[PDB]
Write a protein that binds this ligand. Structure first.
Ligand code: HEM
Ligand SMILES: O=N[O-]
Ligand SMILES: O=N[O-]
Length: 184
């Protein structure tokens, strides 16, 4: 179960973050890791489409090859804090699992600038028991975390050395699909 009420960035710039571009997860901190963790790569695009805030997600396990995409409409709870109902889709946006009430994540942008961000998410999926996940994002997929986002990790009272890097996974990403999914 999740335990954190993450605080959104003061002065969060929604239009800059939700600009239609891709964010790559470069490091993450799962507060309830499995006995045996599945080391996934992940990326998202976040944008507005025809007036609706949207996110498209990509997950890829470079060992098992499990790969899935999702599209969500976000609903605003406060500045920088959203509730997202997801539908699983193929890369083209065709629906594989429809939206349903128990399947949603919260998302909070704790820090962002033009190139980097720190987010919190709490995933709810059916009768699964899932915990908090923090992620460091970058606009460039293998960028090492710079000083601004690492300071934000500290200011959240987290220890960056606890985070797991995705940078030495042989991660590959379909960034064109993520962009086009925003409309689906
Ligand atoms: C590298 C960081 C991440 C890792 C290691 C990771 C890992 C996973 C795993 C293992 C699952 C499968 C859960 C299950 O069904 O048992 C999953 C599902 C999911 N994750 Fe992540 N995740 C990451 C980042 C994210 C982010 C940043 C978001 C939100 C923006 C997110 C949203 C979701 C959603 C919505 C599902 C369910 C999708 C579906 O069933 O259609 N994940 N994640
Ligand atoms: O990756 N199985 O939807
Ligand atoms: O673990 N992905 O929310």
């Amino acid at each position: 179960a999740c335990t954190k009420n993450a605080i959104a960035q003061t002065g969060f710039n929604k239009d800059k973050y939700f600009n239609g571009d891709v964010w790559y997860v470069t490091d993450y901190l799962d507060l309830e890791p499995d006995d045996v963790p599945k080391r996934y790569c992940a990326a998202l695009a976040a944008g507005t489409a025809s007036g609706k805030l949207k996110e498209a997600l990509y997950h890829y396990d470079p060992k098992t090859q499990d790969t899935f995409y999702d599209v969500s409409e976000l609903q605003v709870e406060s500045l920088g804090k959203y509730t997202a109902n997801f539908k699983k889709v193929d890369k083209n946006g065709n629906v594989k699992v429809a939206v349903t009430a128990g399947n949603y994540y919260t998302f909070t942008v704790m820090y962002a600038d033009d190139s980097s961000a720190l987010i919190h998410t709490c995933l709810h999926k059916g009768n699964k028991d899932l915990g908090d996940l923090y992620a460091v994002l970058n606009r460039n997929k293998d960028a090492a975390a710079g000083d601004k986002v690492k300071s934000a990790v500290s200011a959240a009272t987290l220890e960056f050395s606890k985070f797991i890097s995705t940078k030495e996974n042989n991660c590959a990403y379909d960034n064109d699909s993520l962009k086009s999914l925003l409309t689906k």
